[PDB]
Amino acid sequence: MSKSNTYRMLVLLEDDTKINKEDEKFLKGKPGKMHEFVDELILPFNVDELDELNTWFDKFDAEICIPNEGHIKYEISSDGLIVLMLDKEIEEVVEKVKKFVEENN
């Protein structure tokens, strides 16, 4: 945010490939690879802003969870690695997260 040290966050979303009989319309459309990074965004997260980041993230977590209708998993490594995991059933948050991250950017 201020300090000369910024990081990036990758959002992974599972996309199902409902293919007709052309492949498998009987199986619950299973995508080749799931939980993969879609894009990375630089967040105003600093190593000396965990408290502020946790406070903001805590608030944003609800603000982002509010518009969310399901479960959400996230991983924040003090090392400076942030990852966002959203299910397909909650793909909405995925877009809300992208806009959110880029919104804070």
How far, in Å, CA of 78 to CA of 55, rounded? 15
Query: What gap in Å lies between CA 94 and CA 84, rounded to an integer?
Result: 9
**Contact call for residues 48 and 36 (beta carbons, < 8 A):** no
**Which CATH number do you get for residue 84?**
3.10.20.250
- Phi-psi group of 87: left, alpha or beta (phi > 0 → left; psi -120 to 50 → alpha; rest → beta): beta
Of 87, 92, 80, 97, give the one whose Cα is nearest residue 39.
Answer: 97
Q: What domain count does the chain have? A: 1
> Burial of 11 by CB count in 10 Å (0-12 exposed, 13-18 middle, 19+ buried)?
buried
Structural domain span for residue 77 = 1-105
Method by which the coordinates were obtained: NMR
